[PDB]
Ligand binder design. Structure first.
Ligand SMILES: [Ca+2]
Ligand SMILES: [Ca+2]
Lengths: 124, 117, 124, 117, 124, 124
């Protein structure tokens, strides 16, 4: 796809990203909320096409930094990371790859995934 | 939460998973539509809470096999979350990852292998 | 399955078990007839999911202790054990696994299985 | 007992086994519906009577192959019975094992691999 | 018992815990008023069922952390702990065990116990 | 507190203790239903007020002995023990200490605690 700046609907807010770099098998967006100096968010994606016996692999990194108060009171920046990796064999059909991606989105929506991620509570 | 069998709306289809194991920090669901062990897709999640200087880590593995021989494809997500980081911004992070996984610039390489240009 | 206390119909009596512990791949029931001190029966089940080349395995242990008179006359506790093990390859269909379990139940009902187990007589 | 061919009611089907060998302490039945040796399911039982200080042991092996290549799955039961232990309570033990093998908490891991939680 | 979230009546307030993990011999609750960042209370219990000769042990840990200002003004999180351990021999009857537990609750209510625990004053 | 004999309400019975010794940091009660020859219950509590850097510790031991017939018929006295220990840092406020003690009483009342303690069954 010809890359363009991206606007995501996130819960009840809208998040705007802009293309920061594009390579042959890699690209990176930056959250428009931020500066070179102070960064608000980054997203990166890279594909690694292996040999015909190897599975091709696709990896994403989403980084969200937030400024938090120090125990002394100083301003301190803290990052939270999320990383996804798709291992897709080259005999696997593209249809079922799409199915896989969508089921992952659905799972990431679920409360049984939300509670440990968002708040640290395990399910029982 | 109290684990219950889950039904996911996946595009225009409905996937139906059943709880297959629950440990202390780990759980595993299984695609009800599976006929054989190798036929059967699975989803597992585990949290590893670290020391106070560490970040807690949550990992998920989604396995979807298909018959061609049966071939398996994996998606794996990992959330590295520092403890001082606020729960609200964590919920934000998760939702934005969902949104990203929606986009074309992600589907084109994942689904069909087209890189962006 | 969400575990619950279990009541079994056994011949012409009813036997009541209660959940004693549940792990990820293991659980244990105890016969409600008994105490920590004096035990009347135990049942345990564990599953071992191997690698994709390995068969998954499922093992059950049923223990029935009985108090018997000593040759001197003292009270002595004697256990009898029964253990089942299902070796199920991961290319084997779940339907035929159910078929296998039910045929095993039927066989355990048979007189040709009952005579050696219950009384020690071999068949001829 | 005097061995005779056996017909088992298995769920909603009927399995039909024929006597295939009888030794002193060992016997073996065979699924009549088998077309080939590898196609054919089998069931075998053997008693090993020990010394007076030992427990007698009875072992059973049930083999059910299926064609996918033919793949074999095994169930094996073993009764360890002390001699002083009363025959009545042995009959009890066997019946309760049957009852247990009926239950969901046993079928879910055996049949489909779901652990209990 | 089928573990589920519990609410405790504590003097004239209500304390709400939620199941945070359940293992075979161990479980852990967390105070619902808390965060990973700012924890407010945890309770954990484990049973070590001993060898046939030994007693079985049950241990509980209750931890209540509180934020306190420092002499430097900095905010400092401080934990107070209570730990209970039941050593129960197998031959001991379940009835007298429940008796023991209830008498311990009664004692923990008494002023001769609360005064040294709560305020650090000894009895006389 | 001025130590005097106490009576505890235990379920639907009343348990009567009497002061057996009082020291500076330690005291001991004895169940009034007992003899030196046949003891029926003891409770003891000690505070180790720590160094200025350390936490102070309060420990309690409750012992309930019961007579049980032996397999040989002989009479055998068996003790069951409960031990509680409060580790309380100096900077921790007396208010939240009383909170901790009361929540421990509440927990000890709960079924998720009584079932493993009283009957040896784990939760699930
Ligand atoms: Ca370009
Ligand atoms: Ca459970």
């Amino acid at each position: 796809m010809r890359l363009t700046d991206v606007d995501l609907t996130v819960g009840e807010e809208t998040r705007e990203y802009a293309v920061s770099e594009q390579q042959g098998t890699l690209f990176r967006f930056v959250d428009k909320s931020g500066t070179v100096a102070n960064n608000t968010g980054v997203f990166s994606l890279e594909q690694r096409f292996g040999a015909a016996n190897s599975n091709r692999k696709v990896t994403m990194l989403l980084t969200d930094p937030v400024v938090v108060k120090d125990a002394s009171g100083a301003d301190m920046t803290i990052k939270a990371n999320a990383s996804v990796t798709f291992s897709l064999p080259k005999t696997y059909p593209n249809e079922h790859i799409t199915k896989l991606r969508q089921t992952l989105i659905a799972w990431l929506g679920q409360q049984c995934v939300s509670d440990p991620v968002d708040s640290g509570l395990n399910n029982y």
